[PDB]
DNA sequence: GCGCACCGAAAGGTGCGTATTGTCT
């Protein structure tokens, strides 16, 4: 699953909660300013705040004060229940290598879609600069504790353009993109994990499952899937035509807070959750 | 954006809207 989130002033804290190697930059635009490897959460806030720190000017100064300023842009993929549930509770490390290449790879056709503008003499030109500043953070458990393997790439506002200078980033080109881009790490991971020796389920709607874990068994593992279930039937509302804000309230009104939480013994949980729920790992 | 109004200063820049699968941000 692909999801994006243009994030602003109001989720500079969000963003910044998010932080091998479970946050890694990448990007063309992260090489130009010397970025590489694991994220630095220093400079990665005020890349937020838009201040490329080499002692250059700020950014996005022309933003209207009516206007909410910016900070970037979330794509957050997360990996199909069963996958989650092979990689963190029967533990195959390989797995989240899977997970991790399918995101990087997505990613770098996002970078060939990012574009900005130029205005020359009233004339304005969409550029495509073809370079990102993204922080990824990789996770590995829901609202609800589940397994839940999924990474927030954090596309930062801003890329460089063929004339050297640095602009807020036209998102367009990747935004109306996300469906697709979905359905580029849908299938990069498949093809990753088909090299492990997994077969895949598919489901005619593009998503696919670890042919040996079934429903029941995934369903065990989705507690929030069943919040929002019970949210649509407890309003008495259809699932499959629910307005967008009912959508929202349906998944908002019942999420929970992240929390506090012993790995190790939630591990454990899940290990004996599986049994209970009759998966055979293999 | 379906080009505007408004920001800063570069006869220049930005938000805005965009999005809509599920494992459920």
Redesign the pocket.
């Known amino acids: 699953?692909?999801?994006?989130?243009?994030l602003?002033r109001q989720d500079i804290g969000r963003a910044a909660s998010y932080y091998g190697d479970a946050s890694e930059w990448q990007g063309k635009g992260a090489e130009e300013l010397g970025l590489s490897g694991e994220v630095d959460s220093k400079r990665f806030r005020e890349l937020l705040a838009g201040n490329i720190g080499e002692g250059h000017?700020i950014?996005?100064?022309?933003?209207?004060?009516?206007?909410?300023?910016?900070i970037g842009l979330?794509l957050?993929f997360?990996?199909?229940?069963s996958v989650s549930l092979q990689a963190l509770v029967a533990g195959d490390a390989e797995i989240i290598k899977a997970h991790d290449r399918a995101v990087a790879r997505t990613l770098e056709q996002a970078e060939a879609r990012a574009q900005?503008?130029?205005?020359?003499?009233?004339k304005?030109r969409?550029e495509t600069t073809g370079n990102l500043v993204i922080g990824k953070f990789r996770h590995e458990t829901?609202?609800?504790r589940?397994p839940?393997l999924?990474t927030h790439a954090v596309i930062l506002?801003m890329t460089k353009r063929s004339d050297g200078?640095w602009?807020?980033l036209?998102?367009?080109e990747i935004?109306?993109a996300?469906?697709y881009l979905?359905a580029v790490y849908n299938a990069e991971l498949a093809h990753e994990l088909q090299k492990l020796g997994y077969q895949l389920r598919y489901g005619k709607?593009?998503?696919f499952?670890l042919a040996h874990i079934d429903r029941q068994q995934?369903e065990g593992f989705?507690?929030?899937?069943e919040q929002?279930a019970e949210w649509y039937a407890a309003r008495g509302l259809d699932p499959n035509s629910v307005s967008?804000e009912q959508?929202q309230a349906a998944?908002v009104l019942s999420?929970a807070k992240k929390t506090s939480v012993d790995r190790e013994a939630l591990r454990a949980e899940w290990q004996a959750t599986a049994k209970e729920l009759g998966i055979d790992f293999s």
């Open positions: 699953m692909l999801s994006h989130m243009v602003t000017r950014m996005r100064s022309a933003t209207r004060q009516d206007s909410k300023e910016r979330d957050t997360s990996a199909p229940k900005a503008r130029q205005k020359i003499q009233g304005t969409i829901s609202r609800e589940d839940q999924h506002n200078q602009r807020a036209k998102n367009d935004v109306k996300t469906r979905g709607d593009g998503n499952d995934i989705s507690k929030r899937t929002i967008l959508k998944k999420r």
